[PDB]
Structure formats: structure tokens, C-alpha cells
Amino acid sequence: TLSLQLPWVEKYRPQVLSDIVGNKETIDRLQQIAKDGNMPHMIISGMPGIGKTTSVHCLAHELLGRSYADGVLELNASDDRGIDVVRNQIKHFAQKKLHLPPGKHKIVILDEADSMTAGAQQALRRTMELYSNSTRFAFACNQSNKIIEPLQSRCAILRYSKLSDEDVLKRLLQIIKLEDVKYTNDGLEAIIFTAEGDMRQAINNLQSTVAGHGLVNADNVFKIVDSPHPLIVKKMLLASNLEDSIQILRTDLWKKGYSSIDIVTTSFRVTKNLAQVKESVRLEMIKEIGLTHMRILEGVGTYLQLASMLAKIHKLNNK
Amino acid sequence: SKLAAEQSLAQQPWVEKYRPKNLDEVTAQDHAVTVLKKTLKSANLPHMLFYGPPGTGKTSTILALTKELYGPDLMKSRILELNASDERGISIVREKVKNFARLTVSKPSKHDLENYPCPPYKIIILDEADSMTADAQSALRRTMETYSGVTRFCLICNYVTRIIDPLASRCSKFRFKALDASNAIDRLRFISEQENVKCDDGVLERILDISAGDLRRGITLLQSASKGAQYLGDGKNITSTQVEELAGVVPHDILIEIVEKVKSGDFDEIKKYVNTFMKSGWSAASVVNQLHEYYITNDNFDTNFKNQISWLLFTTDSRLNNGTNEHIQLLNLLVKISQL
Amino acid sequence: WVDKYRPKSLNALSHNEELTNFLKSLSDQPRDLPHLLLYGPNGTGKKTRCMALLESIFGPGVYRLKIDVRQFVTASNRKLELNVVSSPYHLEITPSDMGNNDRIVIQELLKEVAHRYKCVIINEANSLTKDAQAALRRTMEKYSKNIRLIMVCDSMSPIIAPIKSRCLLIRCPAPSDSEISTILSDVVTNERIQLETKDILKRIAQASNGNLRVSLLMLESMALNNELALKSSSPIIKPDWIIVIHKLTRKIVKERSVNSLIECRAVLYDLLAHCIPANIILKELTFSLLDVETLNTTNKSSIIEYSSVFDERLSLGNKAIFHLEGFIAKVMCCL
Amino acid sequence: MLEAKFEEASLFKRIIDGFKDCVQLVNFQCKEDGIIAQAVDDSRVLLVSLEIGVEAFQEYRCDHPVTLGMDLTSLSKILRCGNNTDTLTLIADNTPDSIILLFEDTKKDRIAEYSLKLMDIDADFLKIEELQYDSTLSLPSSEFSKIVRDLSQLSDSINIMITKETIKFVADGDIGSGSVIIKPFVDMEHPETSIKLEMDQPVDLTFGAKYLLDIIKGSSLSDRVGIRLSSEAPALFQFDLKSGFLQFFLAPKF
Amino acid sequence: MLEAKFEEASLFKRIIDGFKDCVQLVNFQCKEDGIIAQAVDDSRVLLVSLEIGVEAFQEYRCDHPVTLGMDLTSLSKILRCGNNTDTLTLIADNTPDSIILLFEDTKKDRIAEYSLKLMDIDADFLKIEELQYDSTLSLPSSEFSKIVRDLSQLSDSINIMITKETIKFVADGDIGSGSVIIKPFVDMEHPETSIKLEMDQPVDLTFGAKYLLDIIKGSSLSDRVGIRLSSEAPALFQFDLKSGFLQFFLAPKFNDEE
Amino acid sequence: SKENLPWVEKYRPETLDEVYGQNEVITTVRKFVDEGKLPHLLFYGPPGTGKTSTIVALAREIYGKNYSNMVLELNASDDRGIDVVRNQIKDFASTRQIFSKGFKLIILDEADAMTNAAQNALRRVIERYTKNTRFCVLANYAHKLTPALLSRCTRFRFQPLPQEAIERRIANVLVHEKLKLSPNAEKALIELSNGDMRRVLNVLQSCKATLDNPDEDEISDDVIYECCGAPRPSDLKAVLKSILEDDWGTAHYTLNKVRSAKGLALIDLIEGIVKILEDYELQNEETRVHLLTKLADIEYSISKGGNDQIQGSAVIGAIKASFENET
Numbered sequence A: 001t002l003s004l005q006l007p008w009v010e011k012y013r014p015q016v017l018s019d020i021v022g023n024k025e026t027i028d029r030l031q032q033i034a035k036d037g038n039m040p041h042m043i044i045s046g047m048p049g050i051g052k053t054t055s056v057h058c059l060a061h062e063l064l065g066r067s068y069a070d071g072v073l074e075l076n077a078s079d080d081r082g083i084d085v086v087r088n089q090i091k092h093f094a095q096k097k098l099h100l101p102p103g104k105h106k107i108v109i110l111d112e113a114d115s116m117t118a119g120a121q122q123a124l125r126r127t128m129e130l131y132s133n134s135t136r137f138a139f140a141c142n143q144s145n146k147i148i149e150p151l152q153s154r155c156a157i158l159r160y161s162k163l164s165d166e167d168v169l170k171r172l173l174q175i176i177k178l179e180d181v182k183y184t185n186d187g188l189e190a191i192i193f194t195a196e197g198d199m200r201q202a203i204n205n206l207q208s209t210v211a212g213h214g215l216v217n218a219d220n221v222f223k224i225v226d227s228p229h230p231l232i233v234k235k236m237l238l239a240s241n242l243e244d245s246i247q248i249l250r251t252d253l254w255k256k257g258y259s260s261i262d263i264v265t266t267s268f269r270v271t272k273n274l275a276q277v278k279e280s281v282r283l284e285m286i287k288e289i290g291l292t293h294m295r296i297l298e299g300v301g302t303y304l305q306l307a308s309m310l311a312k313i314h315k316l317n318n319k
Numbered sequence B: 001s002k003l004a005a006e007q008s009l010a011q012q013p014w015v016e017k018y019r020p021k022n023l024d025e026v027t028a029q030d031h032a033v034t035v036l037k038k039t040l041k042s043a044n045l046p047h048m049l050f051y052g053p054p055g056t057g058k059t060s061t062i063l064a065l066t067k068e069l070y071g072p073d074l075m076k077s078r079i080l081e082l083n084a085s086d087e088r089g090i091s092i093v094r095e096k097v098k099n100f101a102r103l104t105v106s107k108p109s110k111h112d113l114e115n116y117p118c119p120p121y122k123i124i125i126l127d128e129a130d131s132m133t134a135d136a137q138s139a140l141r142r143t144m145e146t147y148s149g150v151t152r153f154c155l156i157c158n159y160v161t162r163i164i165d166p167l168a169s170r171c172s173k174f175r176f177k178a179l180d181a182s183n184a185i186d187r188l189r190f191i192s193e194q195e196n197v198k199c200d201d202g203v204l205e206r207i208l209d210i211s212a213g214d215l216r217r218g219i220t221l222l223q224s225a226s227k228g229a230q231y232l233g234d235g236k237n238i239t240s241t242q243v244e245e246l247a248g249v250v251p252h253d254i255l256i257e258i259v260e261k262v263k264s265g266d267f268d269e270i271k272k273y274v275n276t277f278m279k280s281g282w283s284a285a286s287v288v289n290q291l292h293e294y295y296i297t298n299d300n301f302d303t304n305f306k307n308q309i310s311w312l313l314f315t316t317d318s319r320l321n322n323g324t325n326e327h328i329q330l331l332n333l334l335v336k337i338s339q340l
Numbered sequence C: 001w002v003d004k005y006r007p008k009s010l011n012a013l014s015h016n017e018e019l020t021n022f023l024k025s026l027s028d029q030p031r032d033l034p035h036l037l038l039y040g041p042n043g044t045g046k047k048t049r050c051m052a053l054l055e056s057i058f059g060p061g062v063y064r065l066k067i068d069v070r071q072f073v074t075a076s077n078r079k080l081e082l083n084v085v086s087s088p089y090h091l092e093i094t095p096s097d098m099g100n101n102d103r104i105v106i107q108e109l110l111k112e113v114a115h116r117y118k119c120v121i122i123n124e125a126n127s128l129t130k131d132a133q134a135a136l137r138r139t140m141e142k143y144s145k146n147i148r149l150i151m152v153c154d155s156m157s158p159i160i161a162p163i164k165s166r167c168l169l170i171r172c173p174a175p176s177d178s179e180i181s182t183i184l185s186d187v188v189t190n191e192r193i194q195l196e197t198k199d200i201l202k203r204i205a206q207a208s209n210g211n212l213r214v215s216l217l218m219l220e221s222m223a224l225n226n227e228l229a230l231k232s233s234s235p236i237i238k239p240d241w242i243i244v245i246h247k248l249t250r251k252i253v254k255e256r257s258v259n260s261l262i263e264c265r266a267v268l269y270d271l272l273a274h275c276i277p278a279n280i281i282l283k284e285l286t287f288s289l290l291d292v293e294t295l296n297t298t299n300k301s302s303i304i305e306y307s308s309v310f311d312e313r314l315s316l317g318n319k320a321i322f323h324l325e326g327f328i329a330k331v332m333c334c335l
Numbered sequence D: 001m002l003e004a005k006f007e008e009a010s011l012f013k014r015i016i017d018g019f020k021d022c023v024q025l026v027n028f029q030c031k032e033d034g035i036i037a038q039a040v041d042d043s044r045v046l047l048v049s050l051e052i053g054v055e056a057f058q059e060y061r062c063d064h065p066v067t068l069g070m071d072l073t074s075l076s077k078i079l080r081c082g083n084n085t086d087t088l089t090l091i092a093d094n095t096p097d098s099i100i101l102l103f104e105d106t107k108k109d110r111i112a113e114y115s116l117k118l119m120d121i122d123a124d125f126l127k128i129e130e131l132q133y134d135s136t137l138s139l140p141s142s143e144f145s146k147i148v149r150d151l152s153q154l155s156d157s158i159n160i161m162i163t164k165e166t167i168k169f170v171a172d173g174d175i176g177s178g179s180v181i182i183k184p185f186v187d188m189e190h191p192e193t194s195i196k197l198e199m200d201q202p203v204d205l206t207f208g209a210k211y212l213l214d215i216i217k218g219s220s221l222s223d224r225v226g227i228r229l230s231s232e233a234p235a236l237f238q239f240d241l242k243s244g245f246l247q248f249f250l251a252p253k254f
Numbered sequence E: 001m002l003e004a005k006f007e008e009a010s011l012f013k014r015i016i017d018g019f020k021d022c023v024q025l026v027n028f029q030c031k032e033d034g035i036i037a038q039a040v041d042d043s044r045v046l047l048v049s050l051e052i053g054v055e056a057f058q059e060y061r062c063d064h065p066v067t068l069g070m071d072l073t074s075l076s077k078i079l080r081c082g083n084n085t086d087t088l089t090l091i092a093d094n095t096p097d098s099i100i101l102l103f104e105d106t107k108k109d110r111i112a113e114y115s116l117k118l119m120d121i122d123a124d125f126l127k128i129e130e131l132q133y134d135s136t137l138s139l140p141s142s143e144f145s146k147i148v149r150d151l152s153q154l155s156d157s158i159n160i161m162i163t164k165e166t167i168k169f170v171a172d173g174d175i176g177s178g179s180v181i182i183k184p185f186v187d188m189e190h191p192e193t194s195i196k197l198e199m200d201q202p203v204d205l206t207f208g209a210k211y212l213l214d215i216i217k218g219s220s221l222s223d224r225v226g227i228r229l230s231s232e233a234p235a236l237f238q239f240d241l242k243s244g245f246l247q248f249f250l251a252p253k254f255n256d257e258e
Numbered sequence F: 001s002k003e004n005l006p007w008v009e010k011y012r013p014e015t016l017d018e019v020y021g022q023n024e025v026i027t028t029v030r031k032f033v034d035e036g037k038l039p040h041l042l043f044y045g046p047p048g049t050g051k052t053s054t055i056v057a058l059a060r061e062i063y064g065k066n067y068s069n070m071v072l073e074l075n076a077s078d079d080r081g082i083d084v085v086r087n088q089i090k091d092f093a094s095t096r097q098i099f100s101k102g103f104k105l106i107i108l109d110e111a112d113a114m115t116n117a118a119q120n121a122l123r124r125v126i127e128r129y130t131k132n133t134r135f136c137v138l139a140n141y142a143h144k145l146t147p148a149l150l151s152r153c154t155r156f157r158f159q160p161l162p163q164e165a166i167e168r169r170i171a172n173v174l175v176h177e178k179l180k181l182s183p184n185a186e187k188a189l190i191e192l193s194n195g196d197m198r199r200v201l202n203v204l205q206s207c208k209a210t211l212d213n214p215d216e217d218e219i220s221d222d223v224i225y226e227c228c229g230a231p232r233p234s235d236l237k238a239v240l241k242s243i244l245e246d247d248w249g250t251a252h253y254t255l256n257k258v259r260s261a262k263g264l265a266l267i268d269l270i271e272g273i274v275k276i277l278e279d280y281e282l283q284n285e286e287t288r289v290h291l292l293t294k295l296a297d298i299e300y301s302i303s304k305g306g307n308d309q310i311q312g313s314a315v316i317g318a319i320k321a322s323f324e325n326e327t
Ligand SMILES: Nc1ncnc2c1ncn2[C@@H]1O[C@H](COP(=O)(O)OP(=O)(O)OP(O)(O)=S)[C@@H](O)[C@H]1O
Pocket: A008, A009, A010, A012, A013, A014, A019, A020, A021, A022, A047, A048, A049, A050, A051, A052, A053, A054, A055, A141, A142, A171, A199, A200, A203, F148
């Protein structure tokens, strides 16, 4: 081996706002903005792998044309983004003179805005306020609560949502048509099921299954990627009889190499996000899980502790 | 030189005076010292993890092994001993331990290779690993995994659960067994004969019975009994009663009074007797242990009563093991077992 | 006064003759002496007996001591200030004068310090955190020819098992009421007090629960109210916090509601803010609640169970009022 | 065995000053024709390579090569006892666990001797030097240091561009941009100040300023510095010694 | 009263540089035959003792001894105004609450005057110097400083060993071991570089490197340093002044004792 | 020499053909490397499953014998902060190889101890430099990794070693060493392993040291049990039978003599009784609830110390009271 090929997430990364199968409303909004111009300060929030960075990249590219190289300032979490950088480099870029069309503006893209320190975020306020006629700011984050309210007050808020089954299925069908891959309906269904609204993870699993077996079938997808972990944990907690839950925990989780910490933590998440049972029984189950979590953090993490946690949860559910 | 060491050992308490210097002095932990003696002729000493009750001889065993391996000359140059009295955070583990592991082994002298095997690796021991944080422990993983050719890691702890699973998997687990009367009577009799401790027939076996698998506490009790018998100068032999008096054991009659107050009596009488008993200083753990022995051993109670007494004593011991007030816990235990 | 009449040697002790003989036996040969841990009720006289034993191991100059200061630097620039009681033959440290920084002081000071050896008296070893005890575990064994520890504590419950094994254990039972009465007799004949009937002294013992430190202090406090002449019915002088706790129990047994729970929390806050530990507060509150004759065995059993549970909670927690108010609410729900 | 005596401890101290900071571990090897040493930084973008011939020493004896690895920091910590004028002798047996540094004054008077613990490093000397480089240039090393010190303030990247008869150093960052342009020239009034340039092909490479800053230290060993650049390999910055040289190979950016 | 005028403020500044860092409180006492000062560090392993005779001053008047204690840090903070060439006069009444430092230039021009607050210290001067020491040696102080600076890097303990005609300093720690061996010798080309040694008994003592490092500061006061060692007492390192001396007494490590 | 390394280090796999147990992931990785499309890998699994050995053998097969120079291997032992990422990882990804031509490999072993800021800075390094370098993240707990970083890599779960592969490795070791092993001894060895090759190798070396002979004899179950201090199924079932059927005092005496004759531990007996009672077909689940709760409480109490006799009596009483509801 001498060199590798580009992954399908990067190779087929959308370069035009029409290729994005994300939230239709915000996509058409950004398309009309790039068509008319006058892009305002924006903050795009959501979950990983739904088309946030690609969306702002496509918007900046379409809005700047060939001037993207000298009119767009990209700053990721991999670069220093402290108070000194905001004071010197961002201010020098915002004060920089640049002849642009009468409908465009310089764009400052800040990826992972939820990781910037409080001082830099505070200094960015007047930085974006005094140069709001020749410099525009686009933040891309996962938690909008991590950005201070003064910064959110000077910008639009775009909350991206999970991708429905239809959109990811359409994108995967387009990728298969562009790549000439042998697939089947159940295989694509299993891929979308294991993706959980994550387009990047879906394309990655598809490419991995293709390069590992060639045929995208549910058997191959399940043998190369385990079932959604939270779902087996939910089925274990929602069991009606103790022996069924014990057998599930033994075979599916413990005999496959899942650590006790992952089991208990996944267990906590499943419960917190549960809606089948009432609030009080959910709180009691969370209490028992958290007592098991305590025991486990002290190094007493074994199968007996999880079995006792399940027994206590069933006793709580035993009226 | 050596004579000063002999005199300092002779003027030292019996715990440090009779510390095992060779791997043969270990009386009961034979399974571990057998492997340690076999690997002494070879050169494939693996990473080890000693765990067990306190006073079983882990530190003594590793010290004797390092001595028999390196000699009294290389004993101070090829050993990195880190105790709980030192800082063992992530910074220390990353800087000092890793710098010592990455360093090369010191050259042995001409007198070293003639009498000792002098293995091509050094030993880094970490005593009382229970106090080490899990992140500083995970930092040791690749440090001990990649530099195994030049250094060997020896962890020592009492609770094996306090050490993370990867570290427990990387090291060979050596469990030190409790030193009861059976496997420690020989060592106790040797210590008694070497000090001319004139005792009765069933004293030594009783001492270890009070020790509950702890040779250090047994040797301390033997030294105290010998001092108390030498001060009197009567020339008689030490009795089991004199030993259990200074060992913190409640007399049998005082325990029978507690059994009578529990069997027959109300809350007020039991509370008054507990308030009177707490005036005389007794450790609540010893009282709970004696009550457990009496209740489980006596063949005059129902099995349904025995399950409940066992669970109540277990709960009381678990509560006392957290630094609680002995009076409140003892009163609650006696009241709960009186309602049975 | 307690301090004006205190024994300075082993031959000056006046109670627990078997303990005095054991101490003389242990001090006969002082160089081959292991570490010692004095445990027993608070106010028995173990801190006097340790100094008397040192007076037998060394010269009489052990009592001529001085207070110095030593500074320490933690992981941050917070400066730890600790005063040390030092003597030309021994030194005394009390790690109960700070927070979670007991391990640093213990390890550094003992390593610097480490007949022929210098004795170390660790006062109130129960406040020693588990990490400080773990640090002292190996320091006790590595330096055994230069440093010998004499740890004074009131209960070996919070002391870890390794430390318990690493030192001899000496129990100090509280003196009988008769010995307390005989001591108070010598004190009142030396302080020139007027006793109409001797039995009052016995009652003092019956009000002290074996505590000699409390007994002498209460005798002197009631001698100032009776103007150096104790009568046949002299009132018993009780501390203020005990009266507050008694009034709290009266309020508990009288009213059981949330409105009374608010004033109970207020009383708990006022008690905690004036340098009163919460464990002693809980102990006294439970013991004086069990004395309430209005309750029955079913109530007292639940009360003692809840007190044990919340004592475990308080020993595992740091916000003491968070457990005290919970115990009070559980007792209110029980009654 | 190792037995190398330096006339002046100062030479060795300056040589080690060159490895200093930019590398942690150094692998030395003495042999019949001298001593060599190599050290690579953690990111593997810089290789420091030394060669000291037999003639650079006042006394050198080798009947059996010895390879020894050590921590650079430990070595420099000990490398300030030379009084510069002291005599320094490096000593080691054929299977060493340590390296002995022996500093002595002319008279029998004061003898400072050190025994440094060695590290075991898998012997794997690199031989990445090229036959021909795209361009070659030499100039006073103090001048090169100034050029690097200027530009460093502006950016973490300094570009070196070579065209016929033109060498241009450039940095461009937040506060602005800077450039230093030098031209080849022969100064007969003293040729140690001349600037030579042989260009077979124009070159244009970018280097991390932090590394060039480490490299300029060699000025203390030689009046001139040779810089060899290629689009096919790490750049070579070389500082000649009397019988020997200190070389820094630096991988260009992307 | 206290009235001591130093020709050059520099002498006093270098003297105080010697107490600097290693001690916090200094107890001075002026009297008919001069000024003495003593300071002991917190751990009590180092005593710094000064003696300045009447002749070291340009003007000295004392009809009534005065003892005064002060914080060393406060004093040095003020001790950088001497211009070195300035004249310095120490002034205090018989029952002082302060000590006045008066720096003046030759001409009336500039007068810097300070009034330093004093601390109350129980007067208790120690007299721990011995009649005879096991061994005595002197050598250039710059040489002693280098010897200490070398070894310090290797360990927190530096051992001094003396045998007939041999003085050996040794340090041994983590990275390895080091030693400096010097031999007695008379240099007529200039005897201030000679190394004298009088040994009545071989000695071998260990000292905490941190303390020897504090002590080497005396080099700035004298060309040579005298070192007196004994197995019965603290070692004495002495730096002579014109009419006076600065002495450092350091307790040997017992095994762990600075 | 390799004869000085322990058996865990001496028998470390150097090629991908020596990594047993993992077949579905090993074949897929081999295909990834042969065909060229090697994505960012995330090896998640328990300790001792062979993740580090797998990635080391993979890098060896990819770059050759010069693996130690063309691969950037970072672990918890090395300082892994956000600045460390920014400088080292970005300079490694942005530049090219100094020894050959090809893609680079960054092995972030034990990356579950990295800071959240470090992962937030690295998640954009993995996405930006993806044409000249790759990323391999090894983890034991998938909860310590941010979901953003967890979604950029292809996840491979290292299952515990099955019976066939662990027996194959045991046979390989018995071929490499002058040693013989009994079949029942081998089964008991596989039972006390839980799919951990480290434990098997360590106890195999230890029982070879226990042999005391020039290795002309075999290693039986007695040697393994006496060397690892693990209880035997015989004594386990005897204690369980005496607890379930015999009298209280007799059960106490039996437990005492069993735990004192071989020096067994109470925690090992607890785990063994839990494993045995898991196959018991029981009545209404209340008995199982009580049993599991009380046994877990006793185990958590043992994990902190106390009286061994009191805890043994507690185990006996808990099992008895739990089974008293089955009638
Ligand atoms: N709506 C979409 N249509 C097509 N491809 C998409 C879409 N969303 C994501 N992708 C794919 O996922 C890759 C990465 O998308 P990103 O925008 O970087 O994810 P993200 O939404 O920004 O979440 P992060 O970066 O983890 S906070 C792209 O290069 C595409 O290949």
C-alpha cells in the first residue's frame, strides 16, 4: 500500500446549498441570503453530524465567489481562540480594507464556538458591533447555552434538528447511485437505524460496510456495527421478568465485552430519556442506577452490582 | 557498620526487629514466595500486584525479594520505592516515575555479580496504591507496558478494588492470605523462643485468634505480654486471660451480662446498661465481633433468629466501618436484636 | 481548677491502678517501645497519662514545653499556618486545626523530624483524614528507630485498620464514681470548700458520666455560685448548649410540624455557628430524646435507628445541618 | 571504550547548547574516526546530527565503539562546570550504564567529575542527507539569526524563497507582514561576511519559526551557516567545526 | 544611642545581602566596641552572626547600647538606595520604635532618609562557637561558591570529607554522583588563592545544599572563606571584613537535618 | 533478549496473524488496508483484548519495520492537552513523512483520559487533515469520549476472547515453552480468565514457576488453584450445599474450614456462589431480588474491609433467608 482514497464524507461533502438534505427551512433561508446578500451575524446550533459546518461553508463560498480566500477568516477549536487572538487577529481582519461587491461582506467563521473562553466571547461583542458593516460573524456550535447572551443578542439563531429517515435515505440513495454499490432495502434500513439521525455516521458506516464486504445487507451491517447500544439497554430495563433482563444483560452486553461503566451510564441516559413509565418510578430507577454508579466508580464494578441494580429496579416496579 | 545495624535491630520493637530479611522467613505466604524464588534464578520477573489483609507481609516479602535479588549494595541504586507519604498525582507519575523507568539500569560492581543474580532490570514499587487516583493509575499503563525491558512494577495494596481494571490485568495478582493460628503458630513460637517469652500452652494460638489474620498485631501483643510479665518478675508464665485483657477483649462475664440484658429487658434497662458499659473503654468492633461469635456459635437459637442476627451484625459492622459514633451504633444494634 | 491539681508522674495517678501498672511495665524498658494509641471516653485522663509516661521515659523537663509556628505551602499559594507544641524530648501535633490539608502537614513535618528517639503526640487522631492516615501508615514503619507515635483519640472507629495494627492499643476506662468523689474530696479540702454533706460530690460524678474534666469544672463553677460553700441542695450547673438541646427536645416532643421544623433548623444553625460539633449535637439530642417518658419503645427504637442512619450520613457528608434537619424531620414523622 | 579529551570544555558545552531545548534524548556513538550524535524531536520534524573527528580532540582513543543514549536536559545541567577553559574528558566502558565527564584545571587542584546515568535507546541512526539540493547558500550566522529573530515576531511560519541571485525570507501574520531580502556578494575586505548562493532550481519552502529559532543557536559554533534546500527533503542548516559539523535537518511545512 | 556612619553604603548592603533570604528576623545590638547582629532561620539549622568593629566606620558614637530587631525583608527593600558610593548613617535613640537609615551624597544635594519600623524580639544571643574544631580550612570564596554550585544540581545534600591533606566535597542523587577534590597549596604568585588546611581529626559531615547555597553569598564580602568543622557542633563558615566578620553556623544533617 | 521479558510482553503479537479472538474486525481491517480505504478507527473494548497489539501489528504491516518512526503514538503516559494537540498533532498531520511516501498514522492509545477541550480541538484536526493522515483511538469506556469525536471514527468493538482462540494461544505458549498442561487444568484456566489474555499468561508463568521441577511433569488443576488462590468447584458446591441444607452451626464450621484449609478469600467464594446460583431455576423472583441485593451489599462492604467472620455469617444468613421464600 502507498496511498489511500478520500472518504465518502469528505469526497461527497456538499459544496452547494442545494445538495444539503438538512432542515429545509433554514437551508432555503441561507440560499435566499446568498442569492440576495446582506448576510447577518448568525449562530448555528444542533447535534454533531447534521450539516452545520458544511452549511456555513457553502454559504460563505456561494456568497464570496472567488474572494473566499481573502474575505473569509476560518478559526476552529484546533487554533488558539483566546482573548489575545480576538484582540489582535480578528480585529485586524475586521479592520482590513477589501473591495467587495455591493452585496457581500467579509465573513468570520468560528467553528466550535461553544469552546471559546468567556473573555474572548466578551471581547468579540464590540469587535462585531463596530465593524458590522464590513465584517460578519458566523458561529457553529452544538450547545447554544455555552455562548453568552450578549453575543446571541446581536445575531440570528438557527437551531438545526435531527435528519428524518427520508432525508438520510435519499442522500444514501444518491451516494449509491454515484458510486454503483450493490445494496438492499433491509441493509439501508439497518444503516439508517444504526445512524440515529447522524448523516456523517451513516455515510461512514455505509463506506465501511462497502469496503469490508461489498454488499450492503442488514447481516453485514449488523456484523460490522453492533446494534444501537442504547436500544439493547432500553429493552433490558423495560423487561417484565427478572430472568429475561438478566439473560439480556448477560448475553448482549456482558458476553460481548461492554464495560460496566458504559452499561450503567448508558442505563442512566436511557432512563432519564424514558417516557413509557411514570415520573416517580423513573426517579426511583435513576436513584438505584446512580447508587450502582457510585459503587462502580469506587472500583466495585462487577456483574453482581448491575444484577442488584436491576433487581432493585424491578422491586420498585413491583408496586 | 554491620554491628551498629545489629544493635539498632536489638533496640528496636519486635515488629521491626523480626522483619523478614530473606524469602525463607515468610512463614505462611508460600505460594507467592515459591514463584519469587523460582524467578530469582531466571530473569523474567513480571509486573506484580500484592493484595490482601494488612499485616500479611507484602512489604516484607517485596523487600526480601529485592534484597535477595540485588544485594545490599544495589539495594539503594536499582529501587524506586514510592509510599503513600509522597505525592503521587498525574504530574509525579508522568515526570519522576517515567524518567526513572526510561533511565538505564545502573552498572553492578564486581562483588555484586559474584554473589547475586543481578537481573538486567530495576524495580519500582508503589506501596499503598489505594490512595492513588485512577487517572494517575491509568498514566502508569503505557509507562509499565513499554519500559518493561528495563524496569518492573510492583504495586502493593489492601483493597484490590481500588486499583483500576487495566492495571490489575497488566500485573500478576498475588493474594496474601490471612495469618491465623494454623499457618503462623510456627513463626509466633519462633519469636517467643528467640525472646524467652515464657507462656502457657494455649497463649500463642489464642493471640493469633485475637489477631484475626494479622501477624503484626500478634507480635505486638506478644511483646506487650512479655513486657508486662518481665516487669512483674514473678517468674511465672503468661496466661491467656492476661493476654486478652490487654488486647481489648471484653471479659466473658460482661458479655453474658449483655446477653441477659438483650434477652430479658426493655428499652430503658438496655439503654442504661449501654450507657454504663460505654464508660469502660471498649472498642465497639470487638464487642460486635464477640456478640457475633456468641450468637452464631451458640446452638440454642432458631435459624430464623440467626439470619436476622447475622444481617443486623453485618449492618452494624458496615456502619461502624465509616467512623460513626460507637455508642449510638451499639445501642441501636442491641435494641434491634432485643426486638427479635 | 483542673490544671492546678493534675498528676505529673505515674506515681501521682489516683485511679485505674491496673492501667498505671501497665504503663510502668511499658516504661520499664523505654527504647524497645512500639507506637501507642490511647483510646477511651473523652475526659478520662489519657492525655495526662501519656505525659506521665513520657515523664518516666525521659526527665522531668518533658512538661517544660514551648509553642512555635511552622508554615506550609500546598499545591496552590494558600499558606497553611500550624502551631506546634515542642519539648526537648517530644513534640505534639494536632491535625484537627485545619481542613483536608492534614496529609501535607503530617508527611512533611514527620519526615523533617525523622533517650535516642523523639516522641510524637498526635492529638485527636479521629479528625485525621483517610489520606493522612494512609500517608502516616508507611511513615510509622520506615522510621521506627527515631520517631515513636503516641496517638490520643476518643474512639478507634474512624481509625483505619493498618494504623490500628501498626501500634499498640491502650484502653482508658472512665474512673468510677467513687474515685471521682475521692478526687473531688481532696480538691475541696485543698481549695478550702465547705461541704455540709459529702454525698453531693457523688452526685457530681452522677452528673458527669465518668468525665473528670467536666466533673472538676462543674464543681468549681457551682462553688462560685454558692460562694465557696456548697450546701445540701446546691443546683447542678449545666452547660448552655445542653440546655439548648434539652429545650429543643421539649419542642420536638411538644410540637411536630413544619413550622416547628423551621425554628428547629434555626436552633441547629445557632448551635453550629458557636463552635459545637454536629456529631455531639446529634448524640446529645438522641440520648435526651430517648429520656422523654411520653414516648414508648416503638418510638424510641425508631429514634435510635434514625439516629444511627443519620450519624452514618453525617460521617459520610460535610454539610452537617443537611443531615441534622433530616434526622429531626424523621423523628417528627415518627412521633 | 570512550575516551575523548577536549582541550576546552567550552567546545562541548556550545555543541550541547545546540541540541538543548529542541530535543530531549540524544544518541551518541564514539568510534575509530570520531564521535557522532543524533537527536530527533517528538514531532519528528527536526533532526540534530553531530560529527566530531579525531583531530578536534587533544586526546582520543577508541579500540571499540560504544553507543550511549542520554537525556539532554541532564547533560546540560552538568555542562556548566567546564569553566570553559577547563579540560573535559568523556569516559565510558564498552557496556556502560553511565557516562563520566571529567573536568580538570591545568594544575592538579580542582577535579570535577560526573557520572551521568544513561538511557537505553534503540540504535537507529538516520541518513537522510541528499546528494544534491535545489539550492545552497551560506551567509554569516549572526545575520541568519537576526533574519530569523526579525520575522519570528510576525508569524509562526517563515518562508524562504530562492530565485536567481535572490534569497528572500518572509513572514506574514496578524499584525502584518515582513520580509528580508539578501543578495549574493563577495567581500574581499573579509570573505567571512560574503553571501554565497548556488541555485540549480528556484525553491520556495515554509518552516515553523519555533524550529528556526532553535536552529540559530549554532551561530556560537561557526561564523557562517550553510543552508541547503530541496523540495524533495528536509532542509539542512549546517554549522562547521574544526574537524566536524553540527547539522539541523528540518522538514518543511505541508 | 545608635550612630554609625559607613563610608560607603555598599558595605552594609553586601552584609545584609548575606542575611537575605535565609533569615526573616535579625536582632542588632550596637555598643561601645561596635555592632553585632544575629539571625536564626525558622528550622533553627542556620545562625547568621555579624560583628563590625568601631574602626569599620567613618564615624561611630555609642554612650549607651541599643538592641533592635527587624524584619530582614523590610531592611533589604530599603537597602538599594545607597548608590553604593553614598554615605550611610544608622541612627536610633535609646528606646527606639524605629531605625533611621540616612543616605547622603557628598554634596548637600540629595538626602534619602528612611524610618524603618522595628519588631520586638526577645534578646537571646547565642554563643555556640567552639574553642577547637576537628578541621579548619580556608580557600578562595569564589572557588567555594563554584564547588557548592556544581554539586547542588545533583542532590539536596553535599558531604564534606576531610583526611590528611585532602578535602573532598560530594553529592549523589538521582541523575548520578559528583565530587570535587581539592588539595592544600601555597601560591606565592598571590597567596589569596592558596588553600590551607589544618586537620586535627578527619571529619565527614553532610549539609543541606539549600543552606550552603545561602552561605556562599559571603563571597561578596571577602576573597577567602574559612570553614571550621566538628563532629560535636554546627560548622562555621566565616567571611572576614575590615574589622569584623560575617559568620554562618550550619548544623550538619543528622541523616536528614540541613 | 526476549527471554527476560514477562510472558505478557514476550508473547506480544507482532503480525496481524497472531491476534486471535478478533476475526470479524481483523479481516475487515486487512481488507481496508489492502484495498486502500482505511478510515479513522476507534478500537473500543475491555482490557487485555488485544487492541494495542492489533494496531501495532497493523502499523507494522503498513509501514514495515520502520514503524517506530512513521507513526505518532500518544498515550496517557504522555502529556495530552489542548496545547499538546495544537502543536504536536497539527504539525504531524500538516507535514509529511521523513522516511518514505504515504499517509501518516496517529495512534491515540488510551484516549479515554483526554480532556474535553483536547477532544474538542482534535475533532476539527481529524476532519481537516484527512487526506494525508489517519486517526486511531483506543478506548475501554466509550462514555469518556465526546459524541462529536465518537461520530467521526468507525467503531470496532473488541469482543472478549472466546474458548477456541484462547486455547489456541495456550497451545502456542505450550509449544514455545517446555511445558505440559492437563485438559481439565486448561478448562479451569479458561474459566478464571473472562477473556483476558494477560491474566492467562501471567498465571501460566506463575504455575510454571510453581512446578518446582525441571518440567518433566504436568500442570494439573491443583497447581492452578493453589497458585491463583481461586476456590475449586468442589469446595464451592460443598459450601453451597452445606449452606442450603445443613444446620447453621454446621454451615459455619464448613465455611470456616473451607476458607481456612486453602486460605481462600470470602469475595472469591461470593462470586463463585453467585455464578453457580445463576443457573438455579427458581420460584417467584423475590428470592432472586433478596439474594442479589444482599450479596451485592456484602460485596461492597468487603470491598472496604471489616470482619471476615461477620461477613461470612452475613453471606450464610442472606442466602438462607433468600431461599426461605422458596417454599
Ligand atoms: N444535510 C446533509 N447533506 C449531505 N451530507 C451531509 C449533511 N449533513 C452532514 N453531511 C455529511 O456529513 C459530513 C460532516 O458534516 P458536518 O456539517 O461537519 O457535521 P456537523 O453538523 O457540523 O456536526 P459537527 O461538525 O460534529 S458539530 C459532511 O461532509 C457530509 O458528508
